[PDB]
Amino acid sequence: MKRVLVVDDEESITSSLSAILEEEGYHPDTAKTLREAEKKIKELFFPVIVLDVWMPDGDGVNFIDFIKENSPDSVVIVITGHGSVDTAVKAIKKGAYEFLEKPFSVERFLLTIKHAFEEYS
Amino acid sequence: MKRVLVVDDEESITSSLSAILEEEGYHPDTAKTLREAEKKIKELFFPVIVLDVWMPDGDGVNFIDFIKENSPDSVVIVITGHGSVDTAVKAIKKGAYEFLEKPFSVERFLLTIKHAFEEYS
DSSP states (O other), X not given: OOBEEEEOSOHHHHHHHXXXXXXXXXXXXXXXOHHHHHHHXXXXXXXXXXXXSOOSSSOSTTTHHHHHHHOSSOEEEEEXXXXXXXXXXXXXXXXXXXXXXXXXXXXXXXXXXXXXXXXXX | OOBEEEEOSOHHHHHHHHHHHHHTXXXXXXXXXXXXXXXXXXXXXXXXXXXXXXXXXXXXXXXXXXXXXXXXXXXXXXXESSOOHHHHHHHHHHTEEEEEESOOOHHHHHHHHHHHHHHHX
């Protein structure tokens, strides 16, 4: 199942990214808090999940630790508008399949998901 | 033996980075061509090597493929002044332990090596 969970305190963004995700047949999700995404993350099977860095509860880079703990085969994408090569690297070796800034187009956004699964396989 | 090979068509840079590397007891090296770094690479044991992207023969990101072929346990660092998050990621999953732009300070430069080994272990 092309299930995907988009975690972002910005309903404005998730709303858009959710339109393109649901269009490809995928199941886009929204989460304003990580803790909430963790409860369901362990209560259901999620192939690929998207979690930005700019989080209210806590950064996303560190959030991976939990995922890689209760979902090693799982793949999560880290995105942030602040931009940073340093944080990007450490965010790639943690549990981020790809690092994309805040602004993104369906072209690069869709390519991320499609590859997110194929890779996980 | 704290051996390190810095590949950069810029003798001006390698000259500096080589001063700090040799200071820590490491053995800094310079290479204006990849092909040359490949011959010696398979002619000796190299724990950590640094290869920038801006190369005359060919990009460094793709160069990793060769290393990961005749040196999987080996760790190489990819650096480029052009800067790019996209290329950075793909350069991290290839064989780059860390991604640092052109300009760098001994503080971040030394930290890369020190961790380069410890990590490889």
